[PDB]
Amino acid sequence: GKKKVCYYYDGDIGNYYYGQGHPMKPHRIRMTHNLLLNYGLYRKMEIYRPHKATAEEMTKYHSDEYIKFLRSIRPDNMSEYSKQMQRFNVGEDCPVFDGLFEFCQLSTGGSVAGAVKLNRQQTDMAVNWAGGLHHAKKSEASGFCYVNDIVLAILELLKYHQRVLYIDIDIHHGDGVEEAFYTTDRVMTVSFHKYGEYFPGTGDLRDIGAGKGKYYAVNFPMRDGIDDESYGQIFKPIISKVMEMYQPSAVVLQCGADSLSGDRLGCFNLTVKGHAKCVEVVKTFNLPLLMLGGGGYTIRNVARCWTYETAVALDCEIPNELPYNDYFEYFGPDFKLHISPSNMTNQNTPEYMEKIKQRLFENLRML
Ligand SMILES: CCC(O)(O)CCCCC[C@H](NC(=O)C1CN(C)C1)c1ncc(-c2cc3ccccc3nc2OC)[nH]1
Ligand SMILES: [Ca+2]
Ligand SMILES: [Ca+2]
Ligand SMILES: [Zn+2]
Secondary structure, three states, X not given: OOOOEEEEOOOOHHHOOOOOOOOOOOHHHHHHHHHXXXXXXXXXXXXXXXXXOOHHXXXXXXXXXXXXXXXXXXXXXXXXXXXXXXXOOOXXXXXXXXXXXXXXXXXXXXXXXXXXXXXXXXOOEEEEOOOOOOOOEOOEOEOOEOOOHHHHHHHHHOOOOOOEEEEEOOOOOOHHHHHHOOOOOOEEEEEEEEOOOOOOOOOOOOOOOOHHHOOOEEEEEEOOOOOXXXXXXXXXXXXXXXXXXXXXXXXXXXXXXXHEOOOXXXXXXXXXXXXXXXXXXXXXXXXXXXXXXXXXXXXXXXXXXXXXXXXXXXXXXXXXXXXXXXXXXXXXXXXXXXXXXXXXXXXXXXXXXHHHHHHHHHHXXXX
């Protein structure tokens, strides 16, 4: 039936700024929040302010040296850490900005607090739109991500769950999460992503895990222009087979919105309904679920996507006519919640989609 949803948000998150021209805009988290408050969704869910995750929490995965560096680096002392910045991949994609560590602490705090709430059986779903920073590595920042809140939240779930399923619908491969759990069967990682001349360059369908983790990493490489019809026809069958074979007791779903049509960095053609169908599919399995954010660089569409996905989590129908909100002008010229796909060609032929699905099904038979 309808589920209890706990949602995490810190009113300060929108003020962190990656710098002029940087596509990552934490302000999109505040737009999302303001839009869902204006739809009245706060009447149906418990809203929590995450704590600032500590160094003890972050070093459950990250090295002590990398966390010490993130805690120390500031725009005023950057000149003294030139060597350390290179070592930890802090620079152009992952800049040093005022309050960087606190931004990591809030992003991580929401994901870890949500996993604790799920472990305690105090909620059916936990939502942290400021989380989902799937590229961060044990001792390195990558692709706008510094602390891997997902790996930390999964480690928390593993205290009570023998098997955890991670699903990543961001247009980019979930490499940091896959890497962390590559050699274990206690976490199965499933990523759908654009593959070929695209960041991070990993996620080939032939990357299936190693050692005890062999067959516990699943990658669905896609080409430009995938649409709702093509995505929907492979997502439900793959996730259904994974659920059947793997039998997880908890799920983490990274909802990166850069897989939507019109994304500044993405080249897919999904609508908000097509992206949210992934949430609907995962919800039907009735397992404790942690829903996280991720990419999304056309910020009006990120706010629409995550507002609608929160409504889906709540089984709450919301009107297409957008309510007035603090960012109303960002949603012009239509002022509607739902988006239209573009006329871009879908390079993912139906035969290509079926063939990759069949190749992944062969790997799932090995569980
Ligand atoms: C949250 C989860 C997520 O998965 O959504 C993150 C996506 C991360 C994409 C990183 C990618 N980095 C690479 O290609 C690099 C180069 N090589 C050495 C690795 C990428 N694309 C686009 C950008 C990009 C980065 C910028 C940085 C500063 C200013 C403008 C910028 N303008 C940009 O683009 C207009 N940088
Ligand atoms: Ca992905
Ligand atoms: Ca694994
Ligand atoms: Zn992305």
